[PDB]
Structures are given as C-alpha cells and as structure tokens.
Design a protein around this ligand. Structure first.
Ligand SMILES: C[C@]12CC[C@H](O)C[C@H]1CC[C@@H]1[C@@H]2CC[C@]2(C)[C@@H](c3ccc(=O)oc3)C[C@H]3O[C@]132
Ligand SMILES: O=c1ccn([C@@H]2O[C@H](COP(=O)(O)OP(=O)(O)O)[C@@H](O)[C@H]2O)c(=O)[nH]1
Length: 439
C-alpha cells in the first residue's frame, strides 16, 4: 500500500478572535479563547491599542493590536485593520492560516470581512438568549415597542418569554439623543443571522430552556456558557487578603461594572446604606467615579462602619475570585450579563440595581424567573437608602433570602454541570471545535 494520510487537528487550526473593546465583551471572549487554546487550538486575539495593555496583563494566546459619536468611523477602521491581519496570516508560515474569525455579535459587518476573505465567521453574543430575542423582535418591527410610559402601562407578551412590563424592556431612553444608535447596534446583531456560520451564546441551556429551544428551532445556535472557568485582574492580592480576614457570609460585594456612572446623589444613597448595614462591604468605585462619592469620604480606602463592620472601597477587583470567596453574602450589581452569569456560576444571590440596555431585563429574570435576587424600586429614578436597606434585609436577613440562596446554589450546580463533560455547553463547544476540523 502507498499513499498519504492528512490529519486535521486543533494544533494546526488557527482561530482568530475579535471582541468589541469593552470589558463585558473582552472578558467572555478571553475565557472562550482560553478554553479553545486548552483544546490545542492556535488562538490569536485581536484588540484595539487602547485595550491591548489590559488584555495583555490579563493573560497560550497570541495577541495582535489594531488602532481604535465615534462609532460610525470605528466600523470603517476595524474593517480595514482586521482584514489586513487576516491576509497577513494567510501568507505567513509560523502559523496555520485562519480557519475562523470569532467576532463580537454587535459587529455583524465582520461576517462580511470573514466571508470576503474566505474564512468562517462565528458571532459571539455577550447577552442572554432572552433579551437577545427581544432585540430580534424589535428588529422585525411587527410589535410596537414605543413607550410614552406617562400615558398608561403596557405589558408585552413574546413567544417563550414571561410577560414583560415596561420597566422589564431593554432601557434605551437613558441615552437620550443617542437612543437610536444604541438601539440600532443591538437590533442589528440579527441583520445577517441566517448567514453566520456559528451563532455562539454565553449562557447555558437549562438556564434559558424555553427561549433557547425557540431560538434553536429558528437558527442553529450554540449555548456555550459560562465561558468563565468553574484572568489576572488588578488588586487581586489586596482584595483576597482583605476578604480572607473577614467572617464567612458577611460581605456585601458592590459593583456597577466597567462603564455605568451613577449620579452623586445615587452614590450618597448607596454610601449611607452600606455604612449603616449589619454587614462588611467591598465596593468597587472606579477611579474616574471616585469624585462623585460624598465629600465626607487613591487606590483603596479602609473604613470602620457606623455599625461596627468593615468596608473597603477599591477601584477594581478580581470579580470572579471575589464572587467565589466564602466571605461574600450577596452581590449588589448593575445586572450586566457577565456579572449576572458570574454570580450564577458562583451561587451568590443578588440585589439588582439595573441602569440601562439589557440590565433591566436581566433583573426581571434574576428576581422573578431564576429567583436568585431582588430588584430595587426607583428606570432613572433615584434608589433611596431605605430601599437599598430593605433589599439587604430581604436577601441577607430574611427567610426569603435563605430560599434565594438555596435557589442560587441550585443554579450554581447546573451551570457547573453544563460546562462539564457531557453537559449541554461542553457538547456545544465541542461541536464548534470538532466541525471546524471537518474536511
Ligand atoms: C455598552 C454599549 C451598549 C451595549 C452594547 O453591548 C453596545 C455597547 C457599545 C459601546 C458602548 C455602548 C453604550 C455605552 C458607551 C460606553 C457610550 C459612552 C461612551 C463614553 C462615555 O463617557 O459615556 C458613554 C458610547 C458607546 O461606548 C458605549
Ligand atoms: O471590579 C470589577 C468589576 C467588573 N469586573 C469584570 O468586568 C465585567 C463586567 O461586565 P458586565 O457584563 O457585568 O457589565 P458592563 O461593565 O459591560 O456594563 C465582568 O467580566 C466582571 O467580572 C471586574 O473584573 N472587576
């Protein structure tokens, strides 16, 4: 016998990944890249020059930099730079040519860049299935989503979703004159959905069974989350030492994510609740937000509270390590999807303080569907300290809070099952990996 065998393996398959330059898009892409590199794939991650440093410190993965109302031009710039990176890799020798580009779902034009260069495109959605179908329905323009909520109250019924009140819909009016643009960006994720080679969602099937099945019947979506493990952030040693020295189940973790900015009055209400509650607290107040703290209050600051507890204000923390720490009682969150799913994967019940876009819908599901949190009552009204304290008491000091915690521990076990061998998310990711190898 005489002939040649050709082997298609992860080690000689080159995966390109390109997140939108924002931490709630960068981070789940990174986690996915680590998982794919673990399977042996060659993974090159592309990111803008102004996020290269953060991505560089947080992480084996090859890293490439490109350059950065400025969105309309952002599309034009990264279309060109990523296309060039694809062609240069098509001609090199120290790497396999790219087989697939994993791109952020909010950049659907990258599908044309991939297909126009002869490679496959995988769209990574960074928000849950449930709010994403809301975007799809807004795009279809059949049902009327306009809200002059001063005139009456509406409740919207969509297939395979619970009834949504007005305050449960994605929040766009916060952006005022920019609401149309932000709206457009989320809706346009679905413009070319029938042409995407792989539709990836950072969620797990048991979490969103009804709507995921609905989507699975229209499109061939792959639920592959949580992508985070069951990434080196700044202040890791400082935060872990402080938490290590606290009592079990005693710390309220507070963070509003990477971009939300609260008013000075809102900061004062949160501050007065945290300084008077019967719990320790770790509160992330980003450097550029520190000036909105009450004047009566710099990498970090330590406090003894009016209730005799301890507080730490810090400009950033390793959130996943924080959420998995035994000292943490609950998570006061803006309900960004990464924060929500990270808390689910850690068993931490939540106090929901949503600010805009998908955070309002996420809080609806957190409180009423998954039943692992309580949502505060004001979408732009001030949340007063008395209301915050009410939610702390319900979550951390009530029999209802014990049930919320039991619920979160149940969902934590299911998220671990989903990404373990035989789990739905492990199967879907291996479907991605295996079929990329196909002849
Ligand atoms: C997150 C996102 C909406 C959700 C979805 O994934 C798409 C995201 C796109 C980028 C995001 C956008 C809305 C918030 C922004 C940070 C906004 C901004 C910039 C500077 C500032 O000072 O204030 C606000 C303008 C735009 O850069 C934003
Ligand atoms: O002190 C912090 C605060 C946030 N995060 C991370 O930053 C992401 C926040 O994204 P999310 O979807 O929750 O909200 P966004 O910032 O996009 O509004 C998550 O991966 C968090 O783990 C963090 O590592 N440290």
């Amino acid at each position: 016998h005489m002939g040649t065998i050709e082997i298609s393996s992860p080690s000689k398959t080159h995966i390109l990944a390109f997140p939108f330059p924002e931490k709630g898009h960068i981070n789940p892409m990174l986690h996915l890249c680590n998982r794919l590199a673990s399977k042996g794939f060659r993974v090159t991650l592309i990111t803008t020059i102004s996020t290269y440093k953060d991505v560089k410190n947080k992480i084996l993965i090859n890293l490439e930099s490109i350059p950065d109302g400025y969105f309309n031009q952002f599309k034009n710039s990264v279309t060109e730079s990523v296309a060039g990176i694809i062609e240069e890799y098509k001609l090199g020798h120290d790497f396999p040519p790219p087989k697939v580009l994993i791109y952020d779902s909010t950049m659907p034009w990258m599908l044309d860049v991939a297909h126009g260069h002869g490679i496959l495109g995988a769209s990574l959605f960074t928000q849950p299935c449930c709010v994403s179908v809301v975007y799809y329905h807004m795009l279809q323009g059949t049902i009327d989503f306009h809200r002059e909520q001063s005139s009456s109250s509406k409740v919207l019924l969509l297939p395979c979703l619970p009834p949504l009140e007005d305050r449960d819909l994605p929040e766009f009016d916060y952006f005022k004159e920019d609401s149309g643009f932000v709206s457009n960006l989320l809706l346009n994720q679905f413009l070319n959905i029938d042409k995407i080679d792989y539709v990836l969602f950072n969620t797990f099937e048991m979490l969103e069974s009804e709507i995921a099945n609905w989507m699975s019947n229209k499109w061939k979506i792959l639920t592959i989350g949580p992508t985070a493990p069951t990434l080196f952030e700044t202040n890791t040693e400082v935060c872990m030492k402080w938490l290590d020295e606290r009592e079990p189940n005693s710390v309220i973790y507070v963070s509003f994510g990477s971009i939300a900015s609260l008013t000075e009055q809102q900061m004062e209400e949160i501050s007065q609740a945290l300084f008077t509650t019967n719990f320790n607290f770790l509160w992330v107040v980003r450097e550029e937000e520190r000036t909105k703290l009450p004047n009566c209050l710099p990498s970090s600051e330590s406090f003894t509270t009016a209730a005799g507890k301890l507080g730490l204000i810090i400009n950033w923390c390793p959130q996943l390590d924080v959420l998995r720490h035994e000292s943490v009682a609950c998570f006061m969150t803006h309900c960004g999807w990464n924060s929500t799913l990270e808390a689910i994967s850690s068993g931490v019940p939540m106090i929901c303080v949503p600010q805009w876009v998908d955070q309002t819908t996420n809080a609806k599901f957190i409180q009423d569907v998954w039943k692992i949190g309580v949502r505060v009552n004001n979408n732009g009204g001030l949340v007063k300290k008395e209301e915050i304290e009410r939610c702390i008491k319900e979550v951390c000091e009530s029999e209802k809070g014990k049930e919320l915690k039991r619920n979160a521990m149940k969902w934590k076990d299911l998220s671990k099952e989903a990404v373990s061998e035989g789990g739905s998310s492990d199967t879907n990711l291996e479907y991605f990996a295996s079929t990329l190898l196909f002849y």
